[PDB]
Design a protein around this ligand. Structure first.
Ligand code: OGA
Ligand code: MG
Ligand code: NI
Ligand code: ZN
Length: 331
């Protein structure tokens, strides 16, 4: 078995290898990359996402989210308070202000220490989940707006044609902005490109160990667990690396820098934080190997998780027994 310790693997495809997206994902899996739940892909030196980032300031963040924490430094939840709209140029100036800017630090490990010590005492503002793309239309390789759709993959594997669409989302971050522990909708893959700015640190649990994280989460968030049998779908819970280590949970960590892609694999729990002002693009995708994960994915039916239009068909076709309860949670 390749990669039996489930380490995060880093790949350096050539420009030739960067042509065929599906083929390269399958290659990475042939080397065991998926066992980690996360991989890094450094694009060939010849590649670029677009020519410059000098003209993005007028993008609107219609609903910036203030991420307010509750709990203790290493075990907390966050809720998202909606703020007034602002442009990317206004958000960048806010990120760089004394109130929100990255503190002085020695290296990434020092900054990580400071994040986990102090995150809960601040409420950073995240421009998350903005439909759109920063890839140039002329970028033909790894253009996250031009991937094969999940509806086409389901149709190709299973023969059933379904409604729905699959488009990318932009994320504008600042110091301490946080993504809570989660797997993707329907345990899909994700791919994330860091277009510009400061790094993003990731934590990940191997898919074969995801139920160990779920059992810890139920212990640490006992009211939430009584409320919902899949409360991590709410995307609000944080657990620090120190607490994971104290509880024996297998995990790994890595820092993504501007110009790098990350892929999350089906049922790979992940969480993390931004180092300072940045912009990422991400989208879900599927392969043949996902279908079995989609069929087994947990679902939230309590009403909290509320998701896209296109998840309906996935539940309806892959999980017909669960469909009526899930759809009630949607309505
Ligand atoms: O960058 C973020 O805030 C969150 N991104 C993801 O969870 C992802 O790409 O799967
Ligand atoms: Mg603009
Ligand atoms: Ni994700
Ligand atoms: Zn729920």
């Amino acid at each position: 078995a390749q990669n039996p310790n489930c380490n995060i693997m880093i790949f350096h495809p050539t420009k030739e290898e960067f042509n065929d997206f599906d083929k390269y994902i399958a290659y990475m899996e042939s080397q065991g990359a998926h066992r980690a739940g996360l991989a890094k892909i450094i694009p060939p030196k010849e590649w670029k996402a677009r020519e410059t980032y000098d003209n993005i300031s007028e993008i609107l963040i219609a609903t910036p989210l203030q991420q307010v924490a509750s709990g203790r430094a290493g075990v907390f939840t966050q809720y998202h308070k909606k703020k007034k709209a602002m442009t990317v140029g206004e958000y960048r100036h806010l990120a760089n202000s004394k109130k929100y800017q990255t503190p002085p630090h020695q290296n990434f490990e020092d900054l990580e220490r400071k994040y986990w010590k102090n995150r809960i005492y601040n409420s950073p503002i995240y421009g998350a989940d903005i439909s759109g793309s920063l890839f140039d239309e002329n970028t033909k390789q790894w253009n996250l707006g031009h991937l094969g759709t999940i509806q086409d993959l389901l149709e190709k594997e299973c023969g059933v044609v379904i409604e729905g669409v699959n488009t990318p989302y932009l994320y504008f971050g600042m110091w301490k902005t946080t993504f809570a522990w989660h797997t993707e909708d329907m345990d899909l893959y994700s791919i994330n490109y860091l277009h510009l700015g400061e790094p993003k640190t990731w934590y990940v649990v191997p898919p074969e160990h995801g139920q160990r994280l779920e059992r810890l989460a139920r212990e640490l968030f006992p009211g939430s667990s009584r409320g919902c049998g899949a409360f991590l779908r709410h995307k609000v819970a944080l657990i620090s690396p120190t607490v994971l280590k104290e509880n024996g949970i297998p995990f790994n960590r890595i820092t993504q820098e501007a110009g790098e892609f990350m892929v999350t694999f089906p049922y790979g729990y992940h969480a993390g934080f931004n180092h300072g002002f940045n912009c990422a693009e991400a989208i879900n995708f599927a392969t043949p190997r996902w279908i079995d994960y989609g069929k087994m994915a947990s679902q939230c039916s309590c009403g909290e998780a509320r998701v896209t239009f296109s998840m309906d068909a996935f539940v309806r076709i892959l999980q017909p027994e669960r469909y009526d309860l899930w759809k009630r949670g949607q309505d």
